[PDB]
Design a protein around this ligand. Sequence first.
Ligand code: XNP
Ligand code: U06
Length: 157
Amino acid sequence: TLSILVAHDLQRVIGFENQLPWHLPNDLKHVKKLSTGHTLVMGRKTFESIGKPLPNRRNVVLTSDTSFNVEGVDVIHSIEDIYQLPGHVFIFGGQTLFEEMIDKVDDMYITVIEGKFRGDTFFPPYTFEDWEVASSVEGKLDEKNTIPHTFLHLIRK
Ligand SMILES: NC(=O)C1=CN2[C@@H]3O[C@H](COP(=O)(O)OP(=O)(O)OC[C@H]4O[C@@H](n5cnc6c(N)ncnc65)[C@H](OP(=O)(O)O)[C@@H]4O)[C@@H](O)[C@H]3O[C@@H]2CC1
Ligand SMILES: CCc1nc(N)nc(N)c1C#CCc1cc(-c2ccc(C(=O)O)cc2)ccc1OC
């Protein structure tokens, strides 16, 4: 199974200056639940912004740098290498990789952040004419999660 895994705001912002524009612990847990024991694929910039590989899953970084070699990280140099990865593979970021993969993936796990943030990186446009809503779950607000958000599982028609 090949999935997209992304959080974007009302205008499809996913990032600002190498970081996430919002602080939302429930979504990180959502990411952890979904991807633990599976595979995350990410472009080089996304990985460097994270800093280190995420625990308890395969971390695959796509780059053209043939010197790239980080411990805990597997490296691929072609989009085409993605299709060779076994198991449940999540396309994790960033804008460049989302643009390359959105027409190829089976489904998308989107967290819609219900706000308008300043961004410099965006999720590509997509229409619900192409995607069935398998589920839509409102996130709970609290002490530490103060921005409305909705977990979507979209499946290609
Ligand atoms: N929530 C997110 O997903 C976030 C992502 N990070 C943002 O990516 C922002 C803008 O740059 P972007 O091009 O979107 O970076 P992504 O694709 O991770 O990674 C780009 C790199 O992936 C690699 N790449 C993507 N496609 C290919 C490819 N087809 N072949 C070889 N390398 C690939 C190539 O890396 P390289 O310069 O070291 O060779 C490319 O420049 C960049 O500002 C990062 O900050 C955000 C923080 C939030
Ligand atoms: C975690 C935000 C997020 N949510 C969803 N639904 N899909 C995604 N693809 C990303 C993402 C991302 C990139 C990113 C992840 C993280 C991150 C940090 C910690 C954990 C964790 O503790 O599980 C997960 C992701 C941190 C920074 C960062 O870019 C700056």
